[PDB]
Amino acid sequence: DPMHNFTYWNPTKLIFGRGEVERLPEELKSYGKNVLLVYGGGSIKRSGLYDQVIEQLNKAGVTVHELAGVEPNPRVSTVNKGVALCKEHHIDFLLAVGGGSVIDCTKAIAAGAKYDGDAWDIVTKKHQPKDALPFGTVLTLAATGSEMNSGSVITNWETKEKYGWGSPLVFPKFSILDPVNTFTVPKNHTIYGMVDMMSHVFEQYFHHVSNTPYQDRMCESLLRTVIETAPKLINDLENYELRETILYTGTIALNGMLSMGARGDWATHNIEHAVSAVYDIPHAGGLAILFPNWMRHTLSENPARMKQLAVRVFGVEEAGKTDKEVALEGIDKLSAFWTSLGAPNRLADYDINDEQLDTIADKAMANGTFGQFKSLNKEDVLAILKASL
Amino acid sequence: HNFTYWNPTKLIFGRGEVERLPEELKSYGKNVLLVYGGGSIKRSGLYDQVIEQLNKAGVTVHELAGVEPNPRVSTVNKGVALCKEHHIDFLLAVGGGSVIDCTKAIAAGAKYDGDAWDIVTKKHQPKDALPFGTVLTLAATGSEMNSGSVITNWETKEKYGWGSPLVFPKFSILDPVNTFTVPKNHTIYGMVDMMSHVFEQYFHHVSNTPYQDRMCESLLRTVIETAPKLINDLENYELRETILYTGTIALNGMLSMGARGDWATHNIEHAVSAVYDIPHAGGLAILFPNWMRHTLSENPARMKQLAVRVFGVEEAGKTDKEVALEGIDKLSAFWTSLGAPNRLADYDIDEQLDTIADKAMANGTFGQFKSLNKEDVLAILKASL
Ligand code: NI
Ligand code: NI
């Protein structure tokens, strides 16, 4: 079957290399002088990046106001605070300095700053953005690829909901990616980032078989590179080369260069979002737990996709085995690989038992059946949740 | 390595997507210059489809026909004049890489009060350009999604590449059906070209590029799997689709992030085609294996990795140089198996090797994997006789 008709468009300027925070003045010159600096819980102050950014913004002659304390799984209360700061200070441009939570929050602020309503209306697709403030990023954690896409995931902590939204208007104008700026990412979140970029590859790879041989190999190649790099990096967290490789693969994993011509599945991500909506756990910690059990649950729909991963990525020999046997062996080896890094493999790792599984499944089903490789209903989610206990 | 990646082109891919022209043209002006080549788009029926879409879009169409393979700068200057004559707002390139590259030179030339050859020779750096889009009819160059252009001066016998951030296509429409009528020889050439572009980006000394290496090796493997089937089934949608898709990725910059390509074989090829006007990738098939052999000693590990990962060479009991040389033979055998030439004699080409070497050396020493001088290119040309 022909690949799906597609449109690829990604206008983000990706700036990569050591010391490239010094590109900020040149990149800021064409935009207005009122800048909102958005950042998280303080790791950029301890790494020294905060003072470097402040120095560059001073050099750029801009008036700086700040939104500090964006939380992991950024909250819409934080977004609305940022929108208010944009209104209060008549902000022209936003600079996101942090991880995916900071970038995702900044996208929601940029769109929320052109909308006279609750920013949660944008997250829930009640209002489709027609304008947005421009923004850029300095990335401090390799994981989500948000530095080079137009998507954003926001939590409503009052309603215990976590949803992804997107807009062609909230691509970053530029993103500055220096491996040195990820050196202080702790081991646990270094592991999470690698789980996340691998999971993004899986999401884009699990589609019905069609004429995507080069896309398949780009996906398999990214997985092999991360698998080769991850054990070395976790034991050598200040290694420039190892951080560089993972920073690079994190961007390609979700900038759209892998998803041309094929609809991703994204069901495991939606289930994970429901778990993090209730318990606030790290996104990719939930992915490491859930993805292998989604793969087991959906295998009968077509074992051929997982079989190809099992053979090309996970070293399974297929001689004398059915496709289902090969695929199941591969899923075990994926789960073993993540566990060998120290990633969690059961919900009990986050002190999550079965008390709220019905609530979590309901939240996953809030928009009806979902998934493109297999359509999932409440019984399916529930089965995947129970297997992940 | 430090790098900057930026590519704002909207890539529109799929069957029947020429019908996207009205929506994509809506935000631009109504004076469109349609640029195309020697008439193959009329023989395919594509010309009439485009005219129908431009009529649907309500635009005033003027035409520049007859852009030649290895587009000549005289055609560019005529195109600039047509832009001034008819107050053109937007250019639509409908053809191959020659047509798109010519259209890029017209788009920039239309904002410069002088000969566009100044732009090709980098005497004038474009400060503005007209916007343009493309409908691609041949899978080869990747010009549909980059900011580069290669223009020939047929009076001086020169062929040079130039570029500008201002001449990315606004959009490019890629329908595999529009490559169905590409004849066997140019189908072969396109696949040789895209593989060569991968080789150019792969032969560098930048240390830490493991994923780029695999993206390159993956593209080569995909083309190798597809090419023998396609040359015997030229109207197969699936096979044309794969080659159209890999052709764009091979030179849209998605493979060269963090690594400066070598590009020496291309510069030597450009000198050959400047004198003899042969197909770009016909020269590449002849030259590239001998460039690979000539530069092997600089670092046998690069070609060795290609030999093992792409060309199925078993390394047990062999030196890196032995593995690499086996890989080069298999690359050359593969291209020959498609019908690509393997010697300069295939194009009735040693009387003009000194001239070709001079033109290749016109900008001094070149090459990133190995720095080449006149003696080097002369040796590669002779090995290619
Ligand atoms: Ni994710
Ligand atoms: Ni080429």
Numbering used by the authors:
A (entry chain A): -1 to 387
B (entry chain B): 2 to 350, 352 to 387
The authors write:
Based on structural and biochemical studies, we report here that YugJ from B. subtilis is an atypical NADPH-dependent group III AAOR that reduces furan aldehyde in the presence of a Ni2+ cofactor. YugJ folds into a two-domain structure consisting of a Rossmann-like domain and an α-helical domain. YugJ interacts with NADP and Ni2+ using the interdomain cleft of YugJ. YugJ was highly active as an HMF reductase when supplemented with NADPH, but it was inactive with NADH, indicating that YugJ is an NADPH-dependent aldehyde reductase.
To address the specific interaction of YugJ with NADP(H), we determined the crystal structures of YugJ in complex with NADP in two crystal forms. The first crystal structure (space group P1) contains both the NADP cofactor and Ni2+ ion and was named YugJNADP-Ni. However, in the YugJNADP-Ni structure, the nicotinamide ring of NADP is disordered, and only the remaining NADP region was built. However, in the YugJNADP-Ni structure, the nicotinamide-YugJ interaction is not observed because of nicotinamide disorder. On the other hand, in the nitrate-less YugJNADP-Ni structure, the nicotinamide ring of NADP is disordered, although similar conformations are observed for the YugJ Asp102, Asn147, and Gly149 residues that interact with nicotinamide in the YugJNADP-NO3 structure. Thus, we propose that NADP(H) nicotinamide in YugJ prefers high structural dynamics for substrate recognition and becomes rigid upon substrate binding. Each protomer of the NADP-bound YugJ structures (YugJNADP-Ni chains A, B, C, and D and YugJNADP-NO3 chains A and B) adopts a closed conformation with a smaller interdomain angle, similar to that of YugJNi chain B. However, NADP binding restricts the interdomain organization of YugJ into the closed conformation. In contrast, the α9–α10 loop of the YugJNi and YugJNADP-Ni structures adopts an open conformation that increases the accessibly of the active site. Accordingly, an additional three-pointed density was not observed in the YugJNi or YugJNADP-Ni structure obtained in the absence of nitrate.
